[PDB]
Scaffold this active site. Structure first.
Site, PDB file in Angstrom:
ATOM      1  N   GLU A 162       0.783  -1.244   0.000  1.00 30.96           N
ATOM      2  CA  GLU A 162       0.000   0.000   0.000  1.00 30.96           C
ATOM      3  C   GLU A 162       0.814   1.293   0.000  1.00 30.96           C
ATOM      4  O   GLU A 162       0.729   2.060   0.967  1.00 30.96           O
ATOM      5  CB  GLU A 162      -0.935  -0.013   1.213  1.00 30.96           C
TER       6      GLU A 162
ATOM      7  N   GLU B  62      -5.368  -8.255  -0.166  1.00 26.78           N
ATOM      8  CA  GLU B  62      -6.153  -8.020   1.033  1.00 26.78           C
ATOM      9  C   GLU B  62      -7.572  -7.669   0.638  1.00 26.78           C
ATOM     10  O   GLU B  62      -7.790  -6.874  -0.283  1.00 26.78           O
ATOM     11  CB  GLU B  62      -5.632  -6.845   1.860  1.00 26.78           C
TER      12      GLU B  62
END
Ligand SMILES: N[C@@H](Cc1c[nH]c2ccccc12)C(=O)O
Ligand SMILES: OC[C@H]1O[C@@H](O)[C@H](O)[C@@H](O)[C@@H]1O
Length: 311
Positions: A133, A247
């Site tokens: 991320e 995720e």
């Protein structure tokens, strides 16, 4: 080839709230050997292993990673691999690097050289993931991440010429930022994004957000999941890259039936689009396993691993 290595990722789960905290157990999950068999027998093929190396590496060159911490990651890699599971080893939280990519570059590239050299002889079931991320200054200028990921890939490739390397876009691995992602001509890349839309639902009551979304939010399926996954699939086809959604998950402060609707809707659409995936996460506040009772959360587990293909 890389499409088959991505297909081999299949269904997976994150060992979260563990090695990506400041230290193992700080966020509530110490890893145990028995997790690996549990996860394999529930139908998962892959462990994603979030690791926040920054807490365990020297601040001055050559930025050496603490040997005891490194040995713990060795243990996780070996126990997953011997017990038949793939394992994705990443660099996870890294506040320093997201805030100042240029200043922290040397330390991050030293961390990747250490990881890559140490694990160079691991089998193809061990995958590397360059940076969880990207955000911060990478959101301001996505090309800073394009430039940095090429440098990190080059380091990895000095010792691991063909290992699958997993790379995502900025905006916290937002699929909408695939448009700005640029990748080297390397035939062994898997592209990743994470899926948590709507944050108002999946992260309701999550205190680590600012602002903290209110609770009491219910969810049912409309068209957003299908629209998102089709956009990502067309990008993946245009760029001839396989996709791993590393995720997705909904926090326990949402009502269970909504979380089950959401989890199954996402898993179904991921698999319709041939995306491998890893659920967030095994045992904590998004968990499918309750260590206190040593019981699976059956409604959520069955949303991930359904007993019939249309359930
Ligand atoms: N209640 C479970 C799962 C859980 C909920 N929130 C958590 C936060 C951290 C770790 C675990 C949890 C446990 O204590 O294990
Ligand atoms: O990102 C920081 C936070 O992430 C959450 O997933 C964890 O549950 C918290 O313990 C942690 O403080």
């Amino acid at each position: 080839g890389i499409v088959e290595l991505n297909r081999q990722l299949g269904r997976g789960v994150n060992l979260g709230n563990a090695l990506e905290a400041p230290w193992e157990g700080a966020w509530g999950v110490r890893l145990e050997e028995g997790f690996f068999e549990l996860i394999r027998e529930a139908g998962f093929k892959t462990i994603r292993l979030p690791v926040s190396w920054t807490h365990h590496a020297g601040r001055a060159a050559p930025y050496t990673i603490d040997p005891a911490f490194f040995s713990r990651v060795d243990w996780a890699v070996t126990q997953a691999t011997r017990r038949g599971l793939n394992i994705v080893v990443n660099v996870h939280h890294y506040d320093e690097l997201n805030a100042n990519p240029q200043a922290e570059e040397a330390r991050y590239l030293s961390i990747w050289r250490q990881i890559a050299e140490r694990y160079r002889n691991q089998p193809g079931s061990v995958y590397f993931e360059l940076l969880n991320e990207p955000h911060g200054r990478f959101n301001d200028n996505p090309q800073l991440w394009n430039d940095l990921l090429a440098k990190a890939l080059r380091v990895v490739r000095e010792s691991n010429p063909s290992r699958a390397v997993i790379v995502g876009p900025v905006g916290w691995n937002s699929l909408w930022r695939l448009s700005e992602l640029r990748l080297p001509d390397d035939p062994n890349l898997i592209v990743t994004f994470h899926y948590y839309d709507p944050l108002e639902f999946t992260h309701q009551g999550a205190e680590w957000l600012n602002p903290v979304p209110p609770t009491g939010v219910v969810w049912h399926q409309q068209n957003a999941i299908a629209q998102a996954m089709e956009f990502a699939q067309r990008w993946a086809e245009q760029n001839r890259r396989p996709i791993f959604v590393g995720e997705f998950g909904a926090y326990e402060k949402g009502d269970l039936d909504s979380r089950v609707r959401w989890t199954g809707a996402v898993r179904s659409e991921l698999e319709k689009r041939n995306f491998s995936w890893a659920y967030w996460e095994f045992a904590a506040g998004f968990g499918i396993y309750d260590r206190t009772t040593r019981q699976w959360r059956t409604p959520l587990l069955k949303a991930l691993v359904p007993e019939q293909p249309k359930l």
